[PDB]
Amino acid sequence: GAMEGILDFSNDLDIALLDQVVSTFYQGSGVQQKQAQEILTKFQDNPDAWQKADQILQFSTNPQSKFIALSILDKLITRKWKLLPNDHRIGIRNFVVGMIISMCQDDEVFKTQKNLINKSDLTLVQILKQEWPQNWPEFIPELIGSSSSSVNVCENNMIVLKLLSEEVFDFSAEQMTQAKALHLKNSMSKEFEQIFKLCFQVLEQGSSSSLIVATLESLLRYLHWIPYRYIYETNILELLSTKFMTSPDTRAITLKCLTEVSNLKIPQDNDLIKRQTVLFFQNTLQQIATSVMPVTADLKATYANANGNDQSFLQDLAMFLTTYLARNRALLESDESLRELLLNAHQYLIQLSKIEERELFKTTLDYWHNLVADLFYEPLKKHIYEEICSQLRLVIIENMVRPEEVLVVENDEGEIVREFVKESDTIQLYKSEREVLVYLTHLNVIDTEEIMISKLARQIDGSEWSWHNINTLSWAIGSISGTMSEDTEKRFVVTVIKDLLDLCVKKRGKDNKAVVASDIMYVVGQYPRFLKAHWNFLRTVILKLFEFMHETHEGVQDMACDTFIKIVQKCKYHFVIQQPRESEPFIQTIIRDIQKTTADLQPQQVHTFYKACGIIISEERSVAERNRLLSDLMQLPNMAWDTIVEQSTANPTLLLDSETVKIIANIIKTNVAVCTSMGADFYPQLGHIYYNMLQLYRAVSSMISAQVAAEGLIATKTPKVRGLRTIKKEILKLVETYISKARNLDDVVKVLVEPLLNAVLEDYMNNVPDARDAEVLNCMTTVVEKVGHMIPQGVILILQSVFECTLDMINKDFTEYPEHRVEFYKLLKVINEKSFAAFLELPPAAFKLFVDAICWAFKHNNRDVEVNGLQIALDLVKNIERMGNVPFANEFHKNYFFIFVSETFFVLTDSDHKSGFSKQALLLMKLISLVYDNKISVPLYQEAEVPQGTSNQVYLSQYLANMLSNAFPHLTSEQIASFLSALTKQCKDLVVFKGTLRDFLVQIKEVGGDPTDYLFA
Amino acid sequence: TAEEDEEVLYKVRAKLFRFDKDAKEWKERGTGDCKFLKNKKTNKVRILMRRDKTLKICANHIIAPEYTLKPNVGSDRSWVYACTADIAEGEAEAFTFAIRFGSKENADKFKEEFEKAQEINKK
Amino acid sequence: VQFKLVLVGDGGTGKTTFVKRHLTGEFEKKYVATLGVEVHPLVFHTNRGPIKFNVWDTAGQEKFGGLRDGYYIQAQCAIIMFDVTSRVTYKNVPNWHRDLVRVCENIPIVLCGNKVDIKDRKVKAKSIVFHRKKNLQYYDISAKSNYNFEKPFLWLARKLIGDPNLEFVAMPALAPPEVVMDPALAAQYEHDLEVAQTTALPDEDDDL
């Protein structure tokens, strides 16, 4: 359409057309908006587009057009400024300056085009970064002078100074070289005396204007870096803490300044300064109390009403109070005349802590943690805060979030259901709350018990009964486990359990019973110490959990299983010994009834149960008794297994049955579960099934392949084939789980490994890509990790079977076969670590693929792959270095040294692998240092490419200068030479080396970078 | 809201997909409660399904007598079928739907209820 | 009445995937980088009536940045996105925020840490504090699992309508039509169906 006209620069720019396109973009919709957007981006991106900026700024009636004009200028100034002829630089400065002067002098424009003015200011600041002070020394004096001539200009100057301070001190680290950042910071520092004088004057001669707010906003920025004397040796604290707190327009910004003041670096041995620090706080709290709200005010209600800027004000008050007090509350704790200030400040925080807003609560909870941690250690302090801490106990107890363990929740219909998913974002919160409450319990264990026990009584009587109340209380009670004496715990837990049992009887119906069930389970699981001392009650608890495993409420059932294993993890010794007055260790009783106990559970719940039994069985250290227990535990699955193995072996037909495939999968999963908790002790059970299991692995593998043959790749999606592959995966998982914990590695090598490799390697190698299980690679990693050193031919066999075929799956893009990709590089890593010889035996073609594979890895953005990619490369270089002066080492360097240098530089400089900067730098440093230390014996150059006897240092620099020259043709030769000189010198100091690399990354983004920047020290 | 005049014959949690024939892929359309609603005035039974949290309608169509539930090759807990007139997004529109459930039992119960609803609508 | 919402954040953080989930219900697994900006209207039904967001989903890759802060002009709200499995994306939050509030000085903004479904989380909960001094709302979210996916829009709606008790409500469900299939199309439906039957549904290991 017509809109594309602006893209023809052979003609003159039709400004009317430009404004129509911009307006179509900002105010339009649909296809028209989209077309307009593409046009504007192409316009913006035209490298002569800047030449139209003045024309646009002059003629346009659309402020967005002018904004876009300024974006075009910014891009030019930030990237190509020093390319420009000098007169174009003067011209650009002049019309940016003129436009700002112009817009500030027209009151209407100043009032209503603030976006455009702000943008113009930033653009100016970009010019200052380039030109100031060296080629603009009069900028600050003249800004200061102009400020007196006009209120609007003075105000806008404050915006400019704010932006300059941000760009120089807050955002310079990633955007400028170290030298340039130092230059500009020093320049700002040198002229700040006068900047501050203006700031202070403005603040004295005004009340709550926009000029005042602008000035204070700039002050917030200055406070990040200015010396403390500007704050403590002028009257400015009094102004901030009194005058500017009174008007709401200035209050928001002032409070943020005062928070930053509270972070200033300040002498610690000076009583005057201390008094000043006390006074501004006193003033500030006084203004809040008399101009905003008193200490008794309901801040929970105020925040909830959400009027005007109240939420942000309350947030900022929380930030101010917590920042100041964490730093300075000791200033207030010894002088009696300051006690009321200390406590009122804390009472405000107590009120702030009642607000319903999670993120704000976290901010306040962080402070409370800081406080109670100090009161726990520091002599003679806790009595000061006894009343505050007492209110804090109530707040925490009443705002306890649901622990991970509690799996029931209330739905929108008021029904208590099992949770759909984990509440992952409240895990940290629960921990934080618990930490504070534990400290608070230690600080006054009598107060805590009293509060909990009477809150509990008001649940039983009915007065305060609700799901929310019984819950938070129950969670709070569980969370303080460990803080009381055994004796007090005993009486406490006894009272709590009685009361919760009473509630269970009294509160009828499915929802009530679920709630109370969940609560008692949580509590009892939290107090193993009590359980250990009270066998009869432990026994009763476990038996009740077994009853709950038959519950139709699925939340309760699931939690019964988690609670069983949680208790068992802590109390297992009491299950393995024979208790007084019992005829058998309780583990025997559990195993005998396992079929009945677990009959209504889902499979994964059964596996959890079996895992728990394994925990107990592994407490038995007499091997005969342990193996016997293991044997008894595995009786059901072993009988199921035996019958299945007899069928299977007679004819591979029956295994097609999906009911049989599920049965098999659950047998192996049960074995995995028990192996997980028994580890090394699981071996006899593994031995009972091992040979038949690997035969099954083969039979199922044949079926999978047959099905893919008869049905196509789509077969891999079917329930049957997924079921068959689940068997393979669980088998692999079982062997991995066992080998990862094995203590007899001789048996692993002699009994387990050869049949494993025989069953899995060729099957992997000879299936089509979509039928290969990444879990094979995962199993092999653990095999190599644990016994690789004992099986060098085995490791060779692993590489042969998986290396090339897996590489060919993952080397066409970065996304297909994501699991294979991740497990592939983990395997190569451990092989490179533990069995480097395996790579030495590779044929040269295959070793070349290995090097390619590693470089491919570090071009991933996927962190799993990239990180291993970089580690492998590092480890490989070390492995080669370790061989010393031998033909393989020399050929490695001749073939691959520069490939590693160039590939590492590539990911360092492309902007798409910033996550790996640290490890890229480490590898590069290693590589450069190899030459710098003459650790490469042969010349890296060939024949008469360069004079005979030329050192590898000289050739390396030559190579790099040439590489960088061609790759970054906008750099000067001097920038390149200076960069490499610096980098090569610094190849033994990683921090400095990395700074030089970062400086280089800044300079490649622009033209004209100063080569002396690389001298920074 | 427009559901007070209806009886809930069946409710189950489900994930609804729609087939993009161009991309040749299934695309999720919503997860939540799929309900079979019978209008008390017309006795006509519809499927109405809404997304969790946003409560937006991801299915709204009569359970036509002519529809047939078909298995998907990938799943033993889903049904696929062709719908000629769904108004979840407003204007009546044809779709091939797949609906998946938490279990095979659930999928089988759905089919049974779906076919019952079809006979009600036939009346 | 409708509100302009700008969505910003590093490339690959899940901005477009988040929006798509809200537009169609789908989860897009492919990463196709946004070019400049894509604008999508998005409506929610609430107890205070319908609220419409004009979502300006911007490009996070520098190479595809387009008009950059030019997109933010006249935004009435924003979401800043990072990826909890990539620390560099959290480190860049202050850069996005800076560029945003320079153009939009007083607007409600939600910070979102995406991809919490992924097991190996890199940006710890405890580390996420940038929002406090800047008065941003913060949520852990997952476009993939839908964890908290509605929260950012529910908060912004409350702040923009100025009513803290605003809730999403069930949109009215009109009686659906009775249509008989076209005799002429029944041969084609048979075909279109069979392709759909023989394309596997994604994520068959998910709970639903």
Ligand SMILES: Nc1nc2c(ncn2[C@@H]2O[C@H](COP(=O)(O)OP(=O)(O)NP(=O)(O)O)[C@@H](O)[C@H]2O)c(=O)[nH]1
């Ligand atoms: N695991 C997981 N992956 C996600 C989630 N959200 C998005 N992704 C994935 O992350 C990748 C990038 O998503 P995309 O929406 O394009 O990110 P973007 O921020 O829009 N990128 P750009 O700024 O370049 O347009 C996609 O593969 C997508 O499927 C999530 O919650 N969990």
Ligand SMILES: *[C@H](Cc1nnco1)n1cnc(-c2cc(C(F)(F)F)cc(C(F)(F)F)c2)n1
């Ligand atoms: C209330 C919860 C409930 N749900 N269904 C039936 O009851 N209730 C009643 N008794 C218990 C309970 C009792 C014990 C006992 F008796 F051993 F102390 C223990 C538990 C628990 F959870 F196993 F520890 C619960 N709960």
Ligand SMILES: [Cl-]
């Ligand atoms: Cl503008």
Ligand SMILES: [Cl-]
């Ligand atoms: Cl001074």
Ligand SMILES: [Cl-]
């Ligand atoms: Cl023990």
Ligand SMILES: [Cl-]
């Ligand atoms: Cl030069």
Ligand SMILES: [Cl-]
């Ligand atoms: Cl990371």
Ligand SMILES: [Mg+2]
């Ligand atoms: Mg995108």
